[PDB]
Amino acid sequence: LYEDPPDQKTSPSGKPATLKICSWNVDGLRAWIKKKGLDWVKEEAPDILCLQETKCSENKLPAELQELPGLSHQYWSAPSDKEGYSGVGLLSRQCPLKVSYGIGDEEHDQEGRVIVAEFDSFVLVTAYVPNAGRGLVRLEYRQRWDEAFRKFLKGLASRKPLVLCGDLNVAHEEIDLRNPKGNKKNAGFTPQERQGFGELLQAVPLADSFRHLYPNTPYAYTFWTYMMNARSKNVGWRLDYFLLSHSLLPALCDSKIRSKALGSDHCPITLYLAL
Ligand SMILES: [Mg+2]
């Protein structure tokens, strides 16, 4: 149902891509490593790799990671005492000017969900947004997270062009999932989460890189439940995004969905910028 087109490696002005960013919700760093996740990273060779749902504390990291050639500057965030839950990682070829953790709000900074890495010409944010939960029991909290995260990113974008990547835990529009009808009362497709995502795009402001380039392309998903043969049937959701400041749109080469890369219940996404 979906074939990601070939990589467009030049900006519209003809400038070659100089920066390749890869984002991937790994569904547990060790589970991902066993399913050959690293091998794929080596073939992809990104300049920056953002990982979500590492489920790993910084003191219990797999030794195979620090070894990664060309991704030697590594930063991790996990819940302090809570093992096997949430966790994000940012691995970079080049050293960032500054790395920070969280969104500057105590209530929202306890689950190791955000890493901010400032570079010379942009700020990179990687996030694992909180799921609205089974039966939507964490939806009110999710709406408070949405508001604090929008405010935080608006503050960052005012200082430097912003690239936000990661698992944002929302399929924005009906085109973003296989079954919009059956999912309006489920986490990831509630009107509340959809509205929050629309407000993030308008308030920062940010542009959805994949949708900017491919506005009518259906069946392009980044997550399929491990249950009910969803990935073989392409019953998926586009939960993973690259969101860019409008000033970075002339640097945008391509925004890829690496549908065939195995290793997780999510597939990786890749961004090419001519910075
Ligand atoms: Mg998971």
Curated annotation (Swiss-Prot):
Please give the positions of the paired cysteines in each disulfide bond: C22-C50
Q: Where is this site: Transition state stabilizer?
A: N169
What controls its activity?
NPM1 stimulates endodeoxyribonuclease activity on double-stranded DNA with AP sites, but inhibits endoribonuclease activity on single-stranded RNA containing AP sites.
Q: What is the effect of changing R258A?
A: Reduces the interaction with TOMM20. Abolishes localization in the mitochondria
Give the InterPro entries listed for this entry.
AP_endonuc_1, AP_endonuclease_F1_BS, AP_endonuclease_F1_CS, Endo/exonu/phosph_ase_sf, Endo/exonuclease/phosphatase
**Name of the top EC class for this enzyme:** hydrolase
Cofactor note (record):
Probably binds two magnesium or manganese ions per subunit.
Q: Mind telling me which SUPFAM superfamilies this protein's record contains?
A: DNase I-like
Q: Which cofactor does it need?
A: Mg(2+); Mn(2+)
Which residues does Mg(2+) 1 bind? N25, E53, D265
User: What's its catalytic activity?
Assistant: a deoxyribonucleotide-2'-deoxyribose-5'-monophosphate-DNA + H2O = a 5'-end 2'-deoxyribose-5'-monophosphate-DNA + a 3'-end 2'-deoxyribonucleotide-DNA + H(+); Exonucleolytic cleavage in the 3'- to 5'-direction to yield nucleoside 5'-phosphates; a 3'-end 2'-deoxyribonucleotide-3'-phosphoglycolate-DNA + H2O = 2-phosphoglycolate + a 3'-end 2'-deoxyribonucleotide-DNA + H(+); a 3'-end 2'-deoxyribonucleotide-8-oxoguanine-DNA + H2O = 8-oxo-dGMP + a 3'-end 2'-deoxyribonucleotide-DNA + H(+)
Can you supply a Gene Ontology BP term from the record? telomere maintenance
Q: Where is this region: Mitochondrial targeting sequence (MTS)?
A: 246-275
Mutation effect (E53A): Lacks MYC CRD RNA cleavage activity
Question: How the protein is affected by changing C253A?
Answer: Does not abolish the redox activity
Protein location? Nucleus; Nucleus, Nucleolus; Nucleus speckle; Endoplasmic reticulum
S-nitrosocysteine, modified sites: C22, C50, C267
Similarity remark: Belongs to the DNA repair enzymes AP/ExoA family.
Copy the domain comment: The N-terminus contains the redox activity while the C-terminus exerts the DNA AP-endodeoxyribonuclease activity; both functions are independent in their actions. An unconventional mitochondrial targeting sequence (MTS) is harbored within the C-terminus, that appears to be masked by the N-terminal sequence containing the nuclear localization signal (NLS), that probably blocks the interaction between the MTS and Tom proteins.
Q: What does this protein do?
A: Multifunctional protein that plays a central role in the cellular response to oxidative stress. The two major activities of APEX1 are DNA repair and redox regulation of transcriptional factors. Functions as an apurinic/apyrimidinic (AP) endodeoxyribonuclease in the base excision repair (BER) pathway of DNA lesions induced by oxidative and alkylating agents. Initiates repair of AP sites in DNA by catalyzing hydrolytic incision of the phosphodiester backbone immediately adjacent to the damage, generating a single-strand break with 5'-deoxyribose phosphate and 3'-hydroxyl ends.
According to UniProt, the name of this protein is: DNA repair nuclease/redox regulator APEX1
